[PDB]
């Protein structure tokens, strides 16, 4: 029924047929991306047209294509040939990861580098990493992955404990040619294992933990209609899944009395970049755009009940396409449940004699992805009181190197001879806002300190100022924790009962933004990451802060290009882009497997309601 | 057995006897504070001496006394007469709160002010508030409370909805004299009620919430020995209770292999101040020192099972003394339980084929206090991975005023004619550190950005710097979110296996500190609140950031006086004082009862362990 429904296997199968009959899916073609398009603005006509966007790669080296097809009609709407040296290469293909280790195993330079280290080539795993854009002129227009080596002592060994430093290779994965092998010298391969399931490492397992049992004897409070539509505790929304972005939230609304009031049209993590801060040439090119280059949705885990998600769990199993257009189900890839969240409101009044306590709860929508050594959980939360929160959970195994004798200013030591380069994990949330409708504006709110003197005789006053961002050219903002800076998204045409515009306040964590030198390649390709908040006027084709083709793209695309239009954003259809991230100096406690660390942001109502929206919560 | 055991009713009763026989507790005496003293440094002799500190007030106006007694021996160790104009008045007495409303009801100026507003004096509640120190010379040496009025329409009415603005009175509660009545003009008393249990306000209660059941079929994982000693998941600590500070944590340690390793000797919230930023003379004197002036422990709630604390709950009922020295039990005043806390660590490894997930959990120790219109929850958390976290939860009813026609730069409008003055809630955590013993130091850690150029050819490098704080005069630090500033407390004489000093990293929320003008009375009395971090050398008598007698104290005492000593803190017995707070611009959603908002801080291991300390957690 709904246009925001998850993609079905039958839809995937029809796209494959449409492309194949049109002659766009021969044996040399691979699908590098396949995703449903959202209904265009003006969906108040039920023009039921399910359209899919496809990125098609060519393993013979012919030009790739972007293709839009209509599943509803069975038509190719458009197909354009891409000049990848201009607009960027397509995302990395899963089948390309292994070709690097296979190609390097037969290259004389690589084998000679391994022989100098007395390493059995059968035991050497190569991590295939995105290449970026640097000094090499021969790579422009070519599909390049770079490879770093780790030794696996036996099939169940954790290779991350055994990095082979001073060695990197570059690989053209279309022509199947090792372009360069760089050996800057022999480092001792760290010898200790990092096998966190080996009893000699864990010691005896604890017997002290008693079970915690979380059950819902009458089932959950939320309902799921038509595959992916959620109603819970006055909230209404649709949960989408895209192979690039992962979980996407659509049509976030709140039932206030008889009215369904929109809040957010679309919420997503639209890019995430992991830049490394080690100046060694072996790794100074290392930056993962996990969303844009690898696609985080396609490596989503199957979540185990009682282990990954605990309690009364409702699963969704989203369907994606493989490289040949076959439907592939991610079984139990999304978990949804409600959690108790402590006290919501409490007061004991001396004068009235009334004692009042209410409990809070939250709805949780979550998925997990694994990209090589790292594992990331994406969690969206909705609270009873109207708060919306996002939380990223970072875990897995840290990326390693040798620890150089005499230490390092850019690498932490984890174990004898074993280092962990400094890095960041930086996210971009794209919030297509719809506070009581599409006429929205953003105000930046700073605390204002006041000087002692006339009108403030005791020197106690303080205030706040709000500045409306009116045009995109002024809508590039930095955090200021010292002045308590927040941003308010309001609707100037929808007033509360006090005749104030309704609004929501964005609270950031105020973590450092991108640390690289502003003239670096990564600062140009990840320009969004240099500023905490961007506001653009909505446009169909402005989907990602880094543009559509991030892999080996020279930079400048995405947000810097969008805001150059300098469009009106004062009471208009706007999109907020919030940058937030973790700066990771690895600690000993992160090894051999890293405890979860978290970062996020939240939005709270700011005069959206006419009074507390949780007065009708019953007393438990 | 343990010297850190909670005070017993029998101990309280013995103190009362000791004071009475010594002639220090006649009919004009009130006990304003009574608390156990911690064992002095060098407790490695089991000199079992339970000593109590008592503050004794005199309702005839004679000089008050500070008195230390030994319960173990039955002796008065010392008794000193206080000159309160010099060192400050004693904390407010609960019996003094009501005398203000009673005194004002017979004063001709007050009655005339009420008659001008057509208010029935039987219907007027006076909030009795601490007086502070301002321009009035006649108040020095006197015990003053100031009163603001609210109308209660009927016995169960919420008086906070009906502030009487333009009116304040000052009351000498020893001599029982109304010193001043200030009437700056008639404001309309806001007419809407704020009765959040009235069905005409709530509407029909939700029937959509299904129960969440949290049970532990084998009981909790922690044990409680000798009243208040907790062992849980390698953690060991003692939970104390003081009528001033509330819950105090003692002897926080972690069992690493065979060794019990100390982390924190004593943790407490040692002061909390609520300054108002409204320049109207009716309220420009308003600042609550909830800990120092009112004592948050004595207004602790009894926590209801299934409502305030949910799950398998273990209660402590601490005992305090009333104004006459009788023991008073706070039934179920402290809740302790463990909670599931999501994923602890997760990795799915392509090369090894091993899929690994572990769940996290936390131990929770919490209590709630109510001071007039506000209610505060204090929560301490211990995590499996060595993290320690504090969280304050602020709720209750906002303090109100009239909303002036034509608006205000310092007051929010909540309802027609009803305002809420701007304010902050600022806490001081006092952390008597003991990282692997008492030889500790503090380093301030900033991210360091590096310029593109030689050695950093690609412009990707970044680093960090650490600065040792060596003397108290340099140990007064501000936050810097932009540079990711944190503080590390280390032990330079205890190394991990990589020969690095063991440490813990303090992560602040970087919220604004005290906003008042630096020349204000409140900036002088709450000087701790102007800076995020202080480090002092330990001393027995340096207990509170604001000194021992905060009520009507002219200011300067506490931390500014302590650090003037300029003592060595580089590898010494040190105390960290962390300021953190909420800046509250009230929203419509905060009325008529405020949803919980939170602020806090956390400490994480930083090379304290030789690898992850949760490798031995079993697989659920
Ligand atoms: Cu990391
Ligand atoms: Cu407040
Ligand atoms: Na280009
Ligand atoms: Na919008
Ligand atoms: Na004084
Ligand atoms: Na200490």
mmCIF file of N, CA and C in Angstrom, chain A residues 125-212:
data_model
loop_
_atom_site.group_PDB
_atom_site.id
_atom_site.type_symbol
_atom_site.label_atom_id
_atom_site.label_comp_id
_atom_site.label_asym_id
_atom_site.label_seq_id
_atom_site.Cartn_x
_atom_site.Cartn_y
_atom_site.Cartn_z
ATOM 1 N N UNK A 125 47.271 -12.225 4.878
ATOM 2 C CA UNK A 125 46.013 -11.606 4.484
ATOM 3 C C UNK A 125 46.259 -10.149 4.109
ATOM 4 N N UNK A 126 45.648 -9.709 3.008
ATOM 5 C CA UNK A 126 45.715 -8.317 2.581
ATOM 6 C C UNK A 126 44.369 -7.659 2.861
ATOM 7 N N UNK A 127 44.383 -6.604 3.657
ATOM 8 C CA UNK A 127 43.184 -5.781 3.804
ATOM 9 C C UNK A 127 43.022 -4.888 2.577
ATOM 10 N N UNK A 128 41.935 -5.038 1.796
ATOM 11 C CA UNK A 128 41.737 -4.174 0.626
ATOM 12 C C UNK A 128 41.048 -2.871 1.000
ATOM 13 N N UNK A 129 41.724 -1.743 0.807
ATOM 14 C CA UNK A 129 41.232 -0.463 1.292
ATOM 15 C C UNK A 129 41.052 0.512 0.139
ATOM 16 N N UNK A 130 40.118 1.451 0.325
ATOM 17 C CA UNK A 130 39.864 2.460 -0.690
ATOM 18 C C UNK A 130 41.098 3.326 -0.894
ATOM 19 N N UNK A 131 41.237 3.850 -2.117
ATOM 20 C CA UNK A 131 42.506 4.423 -2.549
ATOM 21 C C UNK A 131 42.591 5.929 -2.355
ATOM 22 N N UNK A 132 41.473 6.651 -2.467
ATOM 23 C CA UNK A 132 41.542 8.099 -2.363
ATOM 24 C C UNK A 132 42.219 8.683 -3.596
ATOM 25 N N UNK A 133 42.534 9.975 -3.510
ATOM 26 C CA UNK A 133 43.166 10.697 -4.611
ATOM 27 C C UNK A 133 44.391 11.403 -4.061
ATOM 28 N N UNK A 134 45.565 11.057 -4.592
ATOM 29 C CA UNK A 134 46.794 11.691 -4.142
ATOM 30 C C UNK A 134 47.685 12.036 -5.330
ATOM 31 N N UNK A 135 48.985 11.744 -5.245
ATOM 32 C CA UNK A 135 49.947 12.292 -6.192
ATOM 33 C C UNK A 135 50.064 11.495 -7.486
ATOM 34 N N UNK A 136 49.436 10.326 -7.581
ATOM 35 C CA UNK A 136 49.695 9.389 -8.669
ATOM 36 C C UNK A 136 48.814 9.725 -9.867
ATOM 37 N N UNK A 137 49.444 10.195 -10.950
ATOM 38 C CA UNK A 137 48.694 10.612 -12.130
ATOM 39 C C UNK A 137 48.135 9.419 -12.893
ATOM 40 N N UNK A 138 48.801 8.264 -12.805
ATOM 41 C CA UNK A 138 48.368 7.067 -13.514
ATOM 42 C C UNK A 138 47.086 6.465 -12.948
ATOM 43 N N UNK A 139 46.624 6.914 -11.782
ATOM 44 C CA UNK A 139 45.417 6.356 -11.183
ATOM 45 C C UNK A 139 44.136 7.062 -11.610
ATOM 46 N N UNK A 140 44.229 8.233 -12.230
ATOM 47 C CA UNK A 140 43.021 8.970 -12.570
ATOM 48 C C UNK A 140 42.256 8.233 -13.661
ATOM 49 N N UNK A 141 40.979 7.952 -13.393
ATOM 50 C CA UNK A 141 40.161 7.170 -14.293
ATOM 51 C C UNK A 141 40.256 5.676 -14.086
ATOM 52 N N UNK A 142 41.172 5.219 -13.239
ATOM 53 C CA UNK A 142 41.365 3.807 -12.959
ATOM 54 C C UNK A 142 40.717 3.447 -11.631
ATOM 55 N N UNK A 143 40.400 2.170 -11.486
ATOM 56 C CA UNK A 143 39.819 1.616 -10.273
ATOM 57 C C UNK A 143 40.951 1.022 -9.436
ATOM 58 N N UNK A 144 41.312 1.708 -8.356
ATOM 59 C CA UNK A 144 42.480 1.373 -7.544
ATOM 60 C C UNK A 144 42.018 0.995 -6.144
ATOM 61 N N UNK A 145 42.565 -0.096 -5.609
ATOM 62 C CA UNK A 145 42.531 -0.377 -4.185
ATOM 63 C C UNK A 145 43.963 -0.529 -3.704
ATOM 64 N N UNK A 146 44.216 -0.089 -2.481
ATOM 65 C CA UNK A 146 45.523 -0.265 -1.880
ATOM 66 C C UNK A 146 45.431 -1.357 -0.826
ATOM 67 N N UNK A 147 46.536 -2.050 -0.623
ATOM 68 C CA UNK A 147 46.514 -3.190 0.269
ATOM 69 C C UNK A 147 47.586 -3.134 1.331
ATOM 70 N N UNK A 148 47.194 -3.422 2.571
ATOM 71 C CA UNK A 148 48.116 -3.590 3.684
ATOM 72 C C UNK A 148 48.000 -5.016 4.208
ATOM 73 N N UNK A 149 49.121 -5.555 4.670
ATOM 74 C CA UNK A 149 49.251 -6.979 4.940
ATOM 75 C C UNK A 149 49.230 -7.282 6.434
ATOM 76 N N UNK A 150 48.633 -8.422 6.777
ATOM 77 C CA UNK A 150 48.592 -8.957 8.130
ATOM 78 C C UNK A 150 48.815 -10.464 8.055
ATOM 79 N N UNK A 151 49.561 -11.007 9.014
ATOM 80 C CA UNK A 151 49.879 -12.436 9.025
ATOM 81 C C UNK A 151 48.825 -13.152 9.856
ATOM 82 N N UNK A 152 48.304 -14.247 9.324
ATOM 83 C CA UNK A 152 47.396 -15.126 10.048
ATOM 84 C C UNK A 152 48.145 -16.423 10.341
ATOM 85 N N UNK A 153 48.390 -16.705 11.631
ATOM 86 C CA UNK A 153 49.238 -17.849 11.977
ATOM 87 C C UNK A 153 48.552 -19.180 11.700
ATOM 88 N N UNK A 154 47.229 -19.219 11.803
ATOM 89 C CA UNK A 154 46.429 -20.417 11.589
ATOM 90 C C UNK A 154 45.003 -19.965 11.287
ATOM 91 N N UNK A 155 44.150 -20.850 10.749
ATOM 92 C CA UNK A 155 42.857 -20.381 10.203
ATOM 93 C C UNK A 155 42.007 -19.536 11.153
ATOM 94 N N UNK A 156 42.045 -19.792 12.460
ATOM 95 C CA UNK A 156 41.235 -19.071 13.435
ATOM 96 C C UNK A 156 41.988 -17.924 14.098
ATOM 97 N N UNK A 157 43.173 -17.588 13.606
ATOM 98 C CA UNK A 157 43.987 -16.549 14.216
ATOM 99 C C UNK A 157 43.455 -15.169 13.845
ATOM 100 N N UNK A 158 43.626 -14.222 14.754
ATOM 101 C CA UNK A 158 43.230 -12.846 14.499
ATOM 102 C C UNK A 158 44.388 -12.137 13.806
ATOM 103 N N UNK A 159 44.221 -11.862 12.512
ATOM 104 C CA UNK A 159 45.338 -11.328 11.738
ATOM 105 C C UNK A 159 45.729 -9.933 12.201
ATOM 106 N N UNK A 160 44.787 -9.193 12.806
ATOM 107 C CA UNK A 160 45.031 -7.813 13.211
ATOM 108 C C UNK A 160 46.157 -7.702 14.224
ATOM 109 N N UNK A 161 46.446 -8.780 14.954
ATOM 110 C CA UNK A 161 47.541 -8.757 15.909
ATOM 111 C C UNK A 161 48.903 -8.760 15.236
ATOM 112 N N UNK A 162 48.970 -9.026 13.930
ATOM 113 C CA UNK A 162 50.239 -9.255 13.233
ATOM 114 C C UNK A 162 50.385 -8.384 11.983
ATOM 115 N N UNK A 163 50.405 -7.059 12.128
ATOM 116 C CA UNK A 163 50.562 -6.202 10.943
ATOM 117 C C UNK A 163 51.972 -6.293 10.378
ATOM 118 N N UNK A 164 52.071 -6.200 9.051
ATOM 119 C CA UNK A 164 53.359 -6.180 8.366
ATOM 120 C C UNK A 164 53.588 -4.729 7.961
ATOM 121 N N UNK A 165 54.344 -3.994 8.767
ATOM 122 C CA UNK A 165 54.529 -2.573 8.494
ATOM 123 C C UNK A 165 55.630 -2.362 7.450
ATOM 124 N N UNK A 166 55.737 -1.122 6.972
ATOM 125 C CA UNK A 166 56.710 -0.778 5.952
ATOM 126 C C UNK A 166 56.425 -1.326 4.573
ATOM 127 N N UNK A 167 55.198 -1.778 4.313
ATOM 128 C CA UNK A 167 54.868 -2.426 3.056
ATOM 129 C C UNK A 167 53.454 -2.029 2.670
ATOM 130 N N UNK A 168 53.286 -1.585 1.425
ATOM 131 C CA UNK A 168 51.969 -1.327 0.851
ATOM 132 C C UNK A 168 52.050 -1.585 -0.646
ATOM 133 N N UNK A 169 50.924 -1.994 -1.226
ATOM 134 C CA UNK A 169 50.814 -2.194 -2.659
ATOM 135 C C UNK A 169 49.553 -1.518 -3.174
ATOM 136 N N UNK A 170 49.618 -1.048 -4.412
ATOM 137 C CA UNK A 170 48.456 -0.492 -5.086
ATOM 138 C C UNK A 170 48.066 -1.423 -6.227
ATOM 139 N N UNK A 171 46.760 -1.607 -6.425
ATOM 140 C CA UNK A 171 46.248 -2.629 -7.328
ATOM 141 C C UNK A 171 45.136 -2.037 -8.191
ATOM 142 N N UNK A 172 45.317 -2.092 -9.509
ATOM 143 C CA UNK A 172 44.253 -1.805 -10.474
ATOM 144 C C UNK A 172 43.405 -3.065 -10.620
ATOM 145 N N UNK A 173 42.169 -3.022 -10.106
ATOM 146 C CA UNK A 173 41.335 -4.216 -10.041
ATOM 147 C C UNK A 173 40.503 -4.435 -11.294
ATOM 148 N N UNK A 174 40.538 -3.516 -12.254
ATOM 149 C CA UNK A 174 39.906 -3.777 -13.541
ATOM 150 C C UNK A 174 40.914 -4.473 -14.452
ATOM 151 N N UNK A 175 42.083 -3.860 -14.641
ATOM 152 C CA UNK A 175 43.097 -4.461 -15.497
ATOM 153 C C UNK A 175 43.847 -5.594 -14.814
ATOM 154 N N UNK A 176 43.666 -5.756 -13.504
ATOM 155 C CA UNK A 176 44.323 -6.792 -12.715
ATOM 156 C C UNK A 176 45.844 -6.661 -12.803
ATOM 157 N N UNK A 177 46.324 -5.482 -12.418
ATOM 158 C CA UNK A 177 47.743 -5.156 -12.460
ATOM 159 C C UNK A 177 48.166 -4.529 -11.143
ATOM 160 N N UNK A 178 49.279 -4.999 -10.596
ATOM 161 C CA UNK A 178 49.842 -4.368 -9.410
ATOM 162 C C UNK A 178 50.651 -3.169 -9.893
ATOM 163 N N UNK A 179 50.140 -1.958 -9.646
ATOM 164 C CA UNK A 179 50.810 -0.779 -10.182
ATOM 165 C C UNK A 179 52.097 -0.485 -9.427
ATOM 166 N N UNK A 180 52.068 -0.588 -8.099
ATOM 167 C CA UNK A 180 53.214 -0.225 -7.281
ATOM 168 C C UNK A 180 53.282 -1.135 -6.061
ATOM 169 N N UNK A 181 54.508 -1.448 -5.650
ATOM 170 C CA UNK A 181 54.778 -2.076 -4.364
ATOM 171 C C UNK A 181 55.814 -1.207 -3.673
ATOM 172 N N UNK A 182 55.464 -0.683 -2.504
ATOM 173 C CA UNK A 182 56.329 0.219 -1.761
ATOM 174 C C UNK A 182 56.778 -0.504 -0.504
ATOM 175 N N UNK A 183 58.081 -0.692 -0.375
ATOM 176 C CA UNK A 183 58.681 -1.323 0.792
ATOM 177 C C UNK A 183 59.625 -0.297 1.405
ATOM 178 N N UNK A 184 59.226 0.294 2.530
ATOM 179 C CA UNK A 184 60.034 1.313 3.183
ATOM 180 C C UNK A 184 60.951 0.734 4.250
ATOM 181 N N UNK A 185 61.012 -0.589 4.369
ATOM 182 C CA UNK A 185 61.883 -1.193 5.350
ATOM 183 C C UNK A 185 61.202 -2.248 6.194
ATOM 184 N N UNK A 186 62.010 -3.080 6.837
ATOM 185 C CA UNK A 186 61.517 -4.212 7.609
ATOM 186 C C UNK A 186 61.225 -3.739 9.025
ATOM 187 N N UNK A 187 60.000 -3.967 9.478
ATOM 188 C CA UNK A 187 59.602 -3.865 10.870
ATOM 189 C C UNK A 187 59.327 -5.261 11.414
ATOM 190 N N UNK A 188 59.669 -5.539 12.668
ATOM 191 C CA UNK A 188 59.290 -6.830 13.258
ATOM 192 C C UNK A 188 57.780 -6.995 13.257
ATOM 193 N N UNK A 189 57.317 -8.136 12.758
ATOM 194 C CA UNK A 189 55.888 -8.434 12.826
ATOM 195 C C UNK A 189 55.566 -8.775 14.277
ATOM 196 N N UNK A 190 54.662 -8.027 14.919
ATOM 197 C CA UNK A 190 54.308 -8.295 16.320
ATOM 198 C C UNK A 190 53.861 -9.735 16.522
ATOM 199 N N UNK A 191 54.414 -10.373 17.559
ATOM 200 C CA UNK A 191 54.332 -11.817 17.739
ATOM 201 C C UNK A 191 53.184 -12.288 18.628
ATOM 202 N N UNK A 192 52.729 -11.478 19.585
ATOM 203 C CA UNK A 192 51.636 -11.898 20.454
ATOM 204 C C UNK A 192 50.343 -12.067 19.666
ATOM 205 N N UNK A 193 49.554 -13.079 20.028
ATOM 206 C CA UNK A 193 48.260 -13.240 19.385
ATOM 207 C C UNK A 193 47.217 -12.346 20.054
ATOM 208 N N UNK A 194 46.104 -12.143 19.355
ATOM 209 C CA UNK A 194 45.020 -11.326 19.871
ATOM 210 C C UNK A 194 43.706 -12.078 19.836
ATOM 211 N N UNK A 195 43.767 -13.369 20.166
ATOM 212 C CA UNK A 195 42.624 -14.266 20.016
ATOM 213 C C UNK A 195 41.790 -14.205 21.289
ATOM 214 N N UNK A 196 40.810 -13.295 21.297
ATOM 215 C CA UNK A 196 40.024 -13.003 22.490
ATOM 216 C C UNK A 196 39.067 -14.129 22.875
ATOM 217 N N UNK A 197 39.023 -15.237 22.135
ATOM 218 C CA UNK A 197 38.297 -16.419 22.579
ATOM 219 C C UNK A 197 39.231 -17.546 22.998
ATOM 220 N N UNK A 198 40.529 -17.276 23.108
ATOM 221 C CA UNK A 198 41.484 -18.301 23.514
ATOM 222 C C UNK A 198 41.573 -18.325 25.036
ATOM 223 N N UNK A 199 41.315 -19.474 25.681
ATOM 224 C CA UNK A 199 41.318 -19.508 27.157
ATOM 225 C C UNK A 199 42.628 -19.062 27.784
ATOM 226 N N UNK A 200 43.764 -19.222 27.093
ATOM 227 C CA UNK A 200 45.012 -18.735 27.666
ATOM 228 C C UNK A 200 45.030 -17.217 27.751
ATOM 229 N N UNK A 201 44.210 -16.539 26.950
ATOM 230 C CA UNK A 201 44.126 -15.089 27.013
ATOM 231 C C UNK A 201 43.012 -14.609 27.942
ATOM 232 N N UNK A 202 41.818 -15.208 27.861
ATOM 233 C CA UNK A 202 40.696 -14.731 28.671
ATOM 234 C C UNK A 202 40.867 -15.093 30.139
ATOM 235 N N UNK A 203 41.545 -16.199 30.424
ATOM 236 C CA UNK A 203 41.479 -16.799 31.731
ATOM 237 C C UNK A 203 40.157 -17.523 31.884
ATOM 238 N N UNK A 204 39.876 -18.022 33.083
ATOM 239 C CA UNK A 204 38.578 -18.662 33.322
ATOM 240 C C UNK A 204 37.450 -17.650 33.204
ATOM 241 N N UNK A 205 36.361 -18.065 32.563
ATOM 242 C CA UNK A 205 35.224 -17.169 32.403
ATOM 243 C C UNK A 205 34.520 -16.954 33.736
ATOM 244 N N UNK A 206 33.982 -15.747 33.911
ATOM 245 C CA UNK A 206 33.280 -15.406 35.140
ATOM 246 C C UNK A 206 32.081 -16.317 35.357
ATOM 247 N N UNK A 207 31.868 -16.715 36.610
ATOM 248 C CA UNK A 207 30.647 -17.410 37.000
ATOM 249 C C UNK A 207 29.758 -16.541 37.881
ATOM 250 N N UNK A 208 30.028 -15.242 37.944
ATOM 251 C CA UNK A 208 29.379 -14.354 38.899
ATOM 252 C C UNK A 208 28.157 -13.647 38.336
ATOM 253 N N UNK A 209 27.956 -13.686 37.024
ATOM 254 C CA UNK A 209 26.905 -12.892 36.399
ATOM 255 C C UNK A 209 25.581 -13.638 36.476
ATOM 256 N N UNK A 210 24.628 -13.057 37.165
ATOM 257 C CA UNK A 210 23.328 -13.698 37.193
ATOM 258 C C UNK A 210 22.445 -13.137 36.083
ATOM 259 N N UNK A 211 21.531 -13.940 35.543
ATOM 260 C CA UNK A 211 20.742 -13.481 34.394
ATOM 261 C C UNK A 211 19.830 -12.307 34.733
ATOM 262 N N UNK A 212 19.637 -11.448 33.735
ATOM 263 C CA UNK A 212 18.622 -10.403 33.750
ATOM 264 C C UNK A 212 17.572 -10.781 32.714
#
